[PDB]
Enzyme design. Structure first.
Site, short mmCIF file in Angstrom:
data_model
loop_
_atom_site.label_atom_id
_atom_site.label_comp_id
_atom_site.label_asym_id
_atom_site.label_seq_id
_atom_site.Cartn_x
_atom_site.Cartn_y
_atom_site.Cartn_z
CG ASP A 1 -1.79 1.26 1.30
OD1 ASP A 1 -1.79 1.82 -0.03
OD2 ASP A 1 -2.45 1.35 2.28
CB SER B 1 -1.97 14.45 -13.65
OG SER B 1 -2.22 14.27 -14.91
N1 LIG Z 1 -4.51 3.60 0.56
C1 LIG Z 1 -5.37 2.73 1.24
N2 LIG Z 1 -5.34 1.74 1.89
C2 LIG Z 1 -6.41 0.95 2.38
C3 LIG Z 1 -5.88 -0.07 3.25
C4 LIG Z 1 -6.99 -1.00 3.82
C5 LIG Z 1 -7.70 -1.67 3.01
C6 LIG Z 1 -7.22 -2.78 2.19
C7 LIG Z 1 -7.94 -3.44 1.12
C8 LIG Z 1 -9.38 -3.40 1.09
C9 LIG Z 1 -9.90 -2.44 1.97
C10 LIG Z 1 -9.12 -1.74 2.83
C11 LIG Z 1 -7.67 1.67 2.41
C12 LIG Z 1 -7.68 2.76 1.75
O1 LIG Z 1 -8.87 3.39 1.70
N3 LIG Z 1 -6.66 3.47 1.03
#
Ligand SMILES: Nc1nc(CCc2ccccc2)cc(=O)[nH]1
Length: 330
Positions: free
Chosen positions: A35, A199
């Site tokens: 992430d 962008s």
């Molecule tokens: N950048 C980001 N990361 C998450 C991570 C948590 C998550 C992971 C998979 C499915 C649902 C939620 C949630 C979000 O909204 N944005």
């Protein structure tokens, strides 16, 4: 050093991507969501409330000879989508695709929100935003990439997400065979802790390019492409029958539609998102109304170049002294 690991969509819609990660000694392999929009490495664990575990693989620190409880340290995170998790902290050995960090903070979940429980495919998160966002208290911890960076051949990682197909995260090198043409680099602000960039504009289908500054974040942890209402309206206007639905919570369109592409600017370069990438399928099982992959960022407060956009590119997260982002077609 370098590392390379394959990343796999969790379902037929590319709702998220998972990447195997080895934690502890002997290794316990968990499939984590890499992430670039957050900065905590957290896992389902032997400590997670039993009723909140439903098919995920768990990290059991007591079974790792290299795990050490980080005294007094706890964590608690709330994501952009309203999901959350919290717990305590161990340090342990973590490896990704051949690349090893000792003493990585592994945040063990005691509690997870229902959306995490309900998704058996994601065993946790591996944050790749800037360490300034890490939630561990009272002593903030570093991300996997921050810990690895000095040892890497080059201080970079790259995201090559697939459309309905596996892709790759590489650490420490640029695979010059993984993209076409050249990589265009663009400036990054880290003031909000994200890979935040600007962008240069957009086009819808075969339409002319609109030069306009769109500030947003490169976020592998967000599924969709969130852009200003004006831009999103311009896109959906090209799809007969598409409408914003307050009840559904965004633009929906007839599933029988063929969607136009969407192009975004990186400097003078252009990344083209094929129309099919924007189709997120029926809003409920059996419905002929489909959910759109480009949505308004109004009221979430930030534009987000999520997987819909990033999977159309080879993306370089350059962690040099002054970080930058690179995009190439592929
Ligand atoms: N950048 C980001 N990361 C998450 C991570 C948590 C998550 C992971 C998979 C499915 C649902 C939620 C949630 C979000 O909204 N944005």
């Amino acid at each position: 050093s370098t590392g390379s690991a394959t990343t796999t969509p969790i379902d037929s819609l590319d709702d998220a991507y998972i990447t195997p990660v080895q934690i502890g000694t002997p290794a316990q392999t968990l499939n984590l969501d890499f992430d670039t929009g957050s900065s905590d490495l957290w896992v389902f664990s032997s400590e997670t409330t039993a009723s909140e575990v439903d098919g995920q693989t768990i990290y059991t620190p007591s079974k790792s000879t290299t795990a050490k409880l980080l005294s007094g340290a706890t964590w608690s995170i709330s994501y952009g989508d309203g999901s959350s998790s919290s717990g305590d902290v161990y340090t342990d050995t973590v490896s990704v695709g051949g690349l090893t960090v000792t003493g990585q903070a592994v945040e063990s979940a005691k509690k997870v929100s229902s959306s995490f429980t309900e998704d058996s495919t994601i065993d946790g998160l591996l944050g790749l935003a800037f360490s300034t966002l890490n939630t561990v208290s009272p002593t903030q911890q570093k991300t996997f990439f921050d810990n690895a960076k000095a040892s890497l051949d080059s201080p970079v990682f790259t995201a090559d997400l697939g459309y309905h197909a596996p892709g790759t995260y590489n650490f420490g090198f640029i695979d010059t065979t993984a993209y076409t043409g050249s990589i265009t680099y663009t400036a990054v602000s880290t003031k909000q802790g994200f890979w935040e960039w600007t962008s240069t504009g957009y086009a819808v289908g075969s339409g002319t390019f609109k030069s306009t500054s769109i500030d947003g974040i490169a976020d592998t942890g967000t599924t969709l492409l969130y852009l200003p209402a004006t831009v999103v309206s311009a896109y959906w206007a090209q799809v007969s029958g598409a409408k914003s639905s307050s009840s559904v919570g965004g633009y929906v369109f007839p599933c029988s539609a063929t969607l136009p592409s969407f192009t975004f600017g990186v400097g003078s370069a252009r990344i083209v998102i094929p129309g099919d990438y924007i189709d997120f399928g029926p809003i409920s099982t059996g419905s002929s109304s489909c959910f759109g992959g480009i949505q308004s960022s109004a009221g979430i407060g930030i534009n987000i170049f999520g997987d819909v956009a990033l999977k159309a590119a080879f993306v370089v997260f350059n962690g040099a002294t002054t970080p930058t982002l690179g995009f190439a077609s592929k």
